[PDB]
Curated annotation (Swiss-Prot), chain A:
Keywords: Electron transport, Membrane, Mitochondrion, Mitochondrion inner membrane, NAD, Respiratory chain, Translocase, Transmembrane, Transmembrane helix, Transport, Ubiquinone. Belongs to the complex I subunit 4 family. GO terms for biological process: electron transport coupled proton transport; mitochondrial electron transport, NADH to ubiquinone; mitochondrial respiratory chain complex I assembly. The gene is MT-ND4. One of its GO terms (cellular component) is mitochondrial inner membrane. Core subunit of respiratory chain NADH dehydrogenase (Complex I) which is composed of 45 different subunits. This is NADH-ubiquinone oxidoreductase chain 4. It comes from the Eukaryota. It is found in: Mitochondrion inner membrane.
Curated annotation (Swiss-Prot), chain H:
The lineage of its organism: Eukaryota, Metazoa, Chordata, Craniata, Vertebrata. It is found in: Mitochondrion inner membrane. Core subunit of the mitochondrial membrane respiratory chain NADH dehydrogenase (Complex I) which catalyzes electron transfer from NADH through the respiratory chain, using ubiquinone as an electron acceptor. Essential for the catalytic activity and assembly of complex I. It comes from the Eukaryota. Belongs to the complex I subunit 5 family. Core subunit of respiratory chain NADH dehydrogenase (Complex I) which is composed of 45 different subunits. This is NADH-ubiquinone oxidoreductase chain 5. The chain crosses the membrane at residues 28-48, 58-78, 84-104. The gene is MT-ND5.
Amino acid sequence: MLKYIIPTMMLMPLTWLSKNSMIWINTTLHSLLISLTSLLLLNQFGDNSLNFSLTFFSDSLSTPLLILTMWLLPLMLMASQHHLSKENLARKKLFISMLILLQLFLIMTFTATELIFFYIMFEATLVPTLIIITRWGNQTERLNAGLYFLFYTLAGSLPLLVALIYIQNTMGSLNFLILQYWVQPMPNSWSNTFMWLACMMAFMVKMPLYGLHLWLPKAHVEAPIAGSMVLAAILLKLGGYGMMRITLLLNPITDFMAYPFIMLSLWGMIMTSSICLRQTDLKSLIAYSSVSHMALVIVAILIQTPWSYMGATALMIAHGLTSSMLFCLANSNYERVHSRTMILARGLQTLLPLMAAWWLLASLTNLALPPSINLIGELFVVMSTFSWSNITIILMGLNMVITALYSLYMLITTQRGKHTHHINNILPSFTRENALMSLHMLPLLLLSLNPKIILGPLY
Amino acid sequence: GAHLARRYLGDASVEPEPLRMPTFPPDYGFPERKEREMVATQQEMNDAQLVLQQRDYCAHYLIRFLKCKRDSFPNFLACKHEQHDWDYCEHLDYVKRMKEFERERRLLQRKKRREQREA
Amino acid sequence: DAPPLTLEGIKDRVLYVLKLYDKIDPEKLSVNSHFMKDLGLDSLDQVEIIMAMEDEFGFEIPDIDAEKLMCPQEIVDYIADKKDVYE
Amino acid sequence: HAFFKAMLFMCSGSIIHSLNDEQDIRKMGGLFKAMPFTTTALIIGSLALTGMPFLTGFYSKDLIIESANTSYTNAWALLMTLVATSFTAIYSTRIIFFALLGQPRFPTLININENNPFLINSIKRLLIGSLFAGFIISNNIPPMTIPQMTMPHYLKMTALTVTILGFILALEISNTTHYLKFNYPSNTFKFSNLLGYYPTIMHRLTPYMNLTMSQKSASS
Amino acid sequence: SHITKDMLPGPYPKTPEERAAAAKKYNMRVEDYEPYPDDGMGYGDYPKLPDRSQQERDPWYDWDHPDLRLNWGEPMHWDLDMYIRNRVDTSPTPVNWNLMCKHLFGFVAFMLFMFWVGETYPTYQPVGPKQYPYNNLYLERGGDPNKEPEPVVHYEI
Amino acid sequence: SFPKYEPSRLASLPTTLDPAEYDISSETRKAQAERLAIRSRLKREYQLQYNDPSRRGVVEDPALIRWTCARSANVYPNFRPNTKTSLLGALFGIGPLIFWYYVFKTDRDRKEKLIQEGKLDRTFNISY
Amino acid sequence: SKMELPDYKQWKIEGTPLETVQEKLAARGLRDPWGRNEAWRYMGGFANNVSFVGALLKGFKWGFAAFVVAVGA
Amino acid sequence: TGQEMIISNWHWLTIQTLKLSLSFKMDFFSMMFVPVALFVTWSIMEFSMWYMHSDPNINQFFKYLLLFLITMLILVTANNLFQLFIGWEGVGIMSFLLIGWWYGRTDANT
Amino acid sequence: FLPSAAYLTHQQKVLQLYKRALRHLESRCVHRDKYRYFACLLRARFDEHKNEKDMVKATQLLREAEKEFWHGQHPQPYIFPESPGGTSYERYECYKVPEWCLDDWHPSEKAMYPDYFAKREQWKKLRRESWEREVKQLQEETPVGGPRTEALPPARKQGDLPPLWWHIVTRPRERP
Amino acid sequence: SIFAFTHVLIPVWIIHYYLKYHVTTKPYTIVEKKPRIFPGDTILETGEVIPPMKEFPDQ
Amino acid sequence: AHIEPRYRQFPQLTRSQVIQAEFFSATMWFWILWRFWHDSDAVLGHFPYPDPSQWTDEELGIPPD
Amino acid sequence: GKRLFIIKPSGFYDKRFLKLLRFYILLTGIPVVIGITLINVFIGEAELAEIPEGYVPEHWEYFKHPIS
Amino acid sequence: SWDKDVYPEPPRRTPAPSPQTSLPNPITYLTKAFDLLVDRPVTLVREFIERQHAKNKYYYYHREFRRVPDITECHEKDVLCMFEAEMQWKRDYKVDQEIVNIIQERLKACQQREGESHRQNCAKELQQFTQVVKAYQDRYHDLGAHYSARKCLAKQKQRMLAERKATKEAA
């Protein structure tokens, strides 16, 4: 695994000692090389995980997320120019090295063994997101966005540390195996309820669950495109990965103590799909869409079926790709007109007649068009929750209906019917945005063909 | 028709109920009138993959119907006399069912009303 | 579905349906006439004329204009606007 | 039915793009002998509706309704099929009358043309389909059920009975339309014409409710 | 750019200078500026409009924005995302609203009651059940190879 | 001859039968004159900054900007917790949640007790 | 681009529903119609477009000949 | 004669006790409906050759119409029920695109 | 709600009613002859009291006319397939491309259509050549301290183009 | 010639190559609902007749 | 070069469309005649619907009550 | 003297991108499919025998396909 | 190929159609021309590819493992027994699921080949399906997501103790 760690380090002094018109080719080329390098990883088989050291290992939950990270970096690094190429050379170099240090801590986080090391790398994942979104937050409340951001994430993720240290010095060390092979059930004293509440509540904050999603919309409407793609895809599915691991302990009380959170997630899934039907600020619709899919994720995690975990990891990866793509398209439209509002920039079936093809394709994946992965995820989660109860399918289907209608509203609102004909500045599509769309939607359809890779440990 | 109108307006005793037509014990005015031959060779009837609610009476007309249909396929209009005769056999089956109906009806009517209007 | 309209042709068709109308004459029926000055007919039958043009050519004209045509030349000009009459 | 109404739509769009995409029956009245390939096409299609006995449309519709009549039915559905067959007769005959054999009202500068190889190929192919394919398919099915075929009297006649009274009823409505009185809306007129009340009520009440609740309750 | 005092804190009071300020700000007639009022629901000081307004505004005026009936400067009714045509169409109906709902509920109620009258009263053409050949056609239903014969017969009648 | 067209929150009141349009006082003439003047000046500013041949960008309407800033960012100021706000908040936020909570407790306790009896149809119920 | 203008004072209305409705409106005492417009709708190849059962009974013109020939077959 | 047969191959995610391959079945309905639908669509291809003579966006129109046919075929053939669900949502969304062919026209996308 | 003045008038209000009732009578009445009859009947009903020197009884009869009209309208008033509401409503808007485009083309295709782009360039020089002085002087020259109208004067001064004409002239051709 | 040639041969050749070898090495694969036998026939495979049906009468 | 449009007169009809129009109407009508007479009797039911069962008491099995 | 002038958005940049995309996938879409076709037309897949007596394999010599 | 022992087939049954027609038989003409014009070149090409692959020989071995003992012969915490124990158990778990898959594919083949008489001569295969799936339902069903081995043995002990109490009470 250090074979992946150390070139990701050595991609950083690269970016320092290149120059003008010289940083870019090196960073992008070598980051794609690292993407092939971790495409080499997928060996994982049968009996257990595979151990990359006395220290690192990979569950098959961790392999597709890790490959998704190393896929998503060069895409991002191409995507985040033309809104900062006119800024200074030193600040631009600082930006690229910030993202590389970010990816380094994400690989550190996904290939963890010890949950304390996982926690350190969790908040080391946090601190570059802050600096990026505050330094290029590009609107007047990036202040409040970063402030809300860091205090929700830390003050939720703070007692998680205390609970894990307590488990450390009541049950020996913290390999995931020695967390396994030695876990004994823990009954319903109220201390157990608070310990479960601490761990699950910290990751609930990071998903988000419904009562703590106003963390999100400021932190995506006032972000640059790089930090937004980072934040959405890698950080929300990182929180889900954490709960997916540490739910191995504390199964004998999760049944008794899981009832409020499921109901919060269900009624909030309906409410969030409703609230993204009427907002302006098109950038924020993807954020509330993300809360809807993560609410479905949380339903899938708290029910504990192998069906549910297969659906959960597929829904993770497909929603990560959908949201990262759709953020990149919304940034394309904001590069066109300086609005961010929804009802302004209209028309565009006429003009840029193939930008609309990518809008159509992403909108139908967010619909969950059926050969895609997102329907695989949502369908298996609905199967598992119907075996959970004979009643919840009202909520899931009504989620499907309202999800269809807001996603279609995003499609046919801004890109259908009449150009406002006082725009007269939009350029025909560059090669770059076409390349970014091409890098999103080739792997989504290629996994739509052969998806046995991305299903979880309980394959 | 209006037989059903009588069954809904009038006295519902002497009008029978369908789906519970077998009410009286058998051969009450028959005695020893039954054959129910059924020479349709039920193992062969299952050998050709016939249909549920076609594993029934007049089956051998259907066996020869499918046999001549398969065996005379480009003669697209060929098997019609067997079709007509299978229709006639099922017509006799339908007639026999209607006779069963009014058998049990007139038994219930005339027997029950005779006994309870002369007793 | 596009036979080409032309200026002489639209002039002839509009004057054909004005000439077919009853209470005018084929004598004092000019291109530069008036529906107010010299034909002397009223606003009511003027809007009957507007109805004839809408029902022949197949499209409404709005009432911001039906106040203020009042001569056959501006009728021809206004269907020249709606149709953009060149080949 | 597939042969049937594909042929019907294709004839209709032929009429519409023949007459400058104007599409409405008022301002379309008399178009018989505006070349009568399309008029023959639509009278074939719309008398195959209800099944002029016996064409392809006969087999499906009439064996369905008589087999329904010979079934342990729900006793109101039988009368619903009755009234529905009558209704489909009367609007079929009304749309033929208003479309074809009226008096020609449609705006002038006619530009009607059907001397066109693709359209006569397509309509030719579909009347040749919808005249034979019902008999050809219904003949050589493997018999997947037991046909009833033993109906009482005045229950096999009833198909032709209802379609004939539908034709006569639309005929007398037509010959009342020849009159002049300028009658009034009687609200059953309005219940039939204005979709009665369901698309207007639901499409103006269900969007407004969820978006009242999206603004006040949910978002703000 | 955008002035600080073209945002909008606080409702109506006091009526001289604040209503003059909102009339200068939102570009309206002075005594047609209506705040909501202040029940504290948020809502700031943004106007009330006549609220239907989109199957209104008859389409031959030829304003600027063609599919929205805008004119670049109207103060833009608060719930506009619910009123783009394609979302909610509030036409003046050809009949009523009360007459609509009473007749629709009446028709569907009467037909469902007739369906119940159908459901309690079937039709049947007067015919007994069929005569299945081997004991109500046994051995070819759900299974039962040698478990139990189920003797029931049919007689020629 | 007609019950005079009761309105609704859905049925718009049409232009004709107001019947306020026929009581034209001088105040309505004054208001219509000033309203036409406002529309005149706004179309003048818009058309001059719409037909500039050098004007590359968009015309940047303050109306749309003002509506958006009123709609999202000018909610939380301003506010006071009223009886109506707090009442409707705890009703439409907590009501459905707690209702759905009790009904899923009821369905789950039914199914747990029922398969604790063992008389459920889980003869083959593998895909759980 | 030529049309040759099939011209006025040719219609001369006389088309029997329009003439009789100008009769009925004459007895009404109005006598002021739109006029000679619709005679291109009431004569030409028009003017007793056939009645409705005629289009249905249109079939056996070539029809009965073929049917009697197949009867002879 | 009969000879009434199913095909079933290329199983993907044969995960737990179940499995699902792309599979479709020739009995009677998916057997002999497909000629009728192909025949009807063949005539409509003729009719839309003529009727849509006057658009340069004609090629995309035939691509959408053939795509709709493919999905209707994979709907009507399958027995593996996930593939039926594939055909279901695909014919729904091709209905969406071809109803909303004429962009503009706010009534159309409504 | 109209560009010319602040209101319609009495006259045009009655007139629009007459147009609407005649149009609805089309939409009610097929066969065109009984249409022609009822149209002359309706014209006579307006002829009964056309010549009231009164005004208040006239506008009260206008309101009672609107009541008997709105009671007697049609469910589908016959809208033409070019009007908004109608079947078209910018039907062929698929190709209604504004002409601020077509200059952002690669010069290969500017070599494909040479003469058109030469004459288009002298159009834009015609625009900019008379943009500043005549147009903006004629706009800030004539009106009152408030404009208070939505018409605009022509360029009767000597020569060149009337002001603010570019997006009026350069529009789509409504059937491409 | 070239259209019908390439399309009703080359994918037909490729699918017919696909439908012998790989489709028969996957074992439970394309399977035929059984060809119905009638009581007057004989077996095509090895060859033995089926007993005819019994007496008809009173048709 | 092809067919023309005319104004307010009856449109001209070429010979091919009119002769195949009459052909298709006639062939429908010939088909429905020949098929109405060759075998079916699809209007009828080919087998006589009886009375109520036979109305023959002392047949069908009763005792004289 | 009949024809008119349509107003298109562009063709250049769009068709240039798609031409580049098919060229740059196809430049290694073609030789790889040629290579694997040569693989399963020459080199052999594998054969289905069992474990020879006293001969442990590699951790390859286990799989059907030769590239795997 | 496969083992026809574990994938049984019913014995084949085919008749010969005997027209009794004079059109005759278009599809026979078509199937003979089909065989001569489709089945010949692919046969030659498969001969060619068979020689080109059988010129040199590969083998892939079916992997086989040993039998490390059990969880029941493992000590308190003592991972180095439990590790082999659980991997032995989990490989039995995967092979047991695939046994269920094989029973289900037999059941589908019986549905299709036996035809529209459903309940004829699939009932022994239906019988063994309900037998094996009663076993699977009793043994691996309600353990949930983090099944390791210990919940499996807990289900085992608790089940047979419940049955022991039930038969003690029934006696």
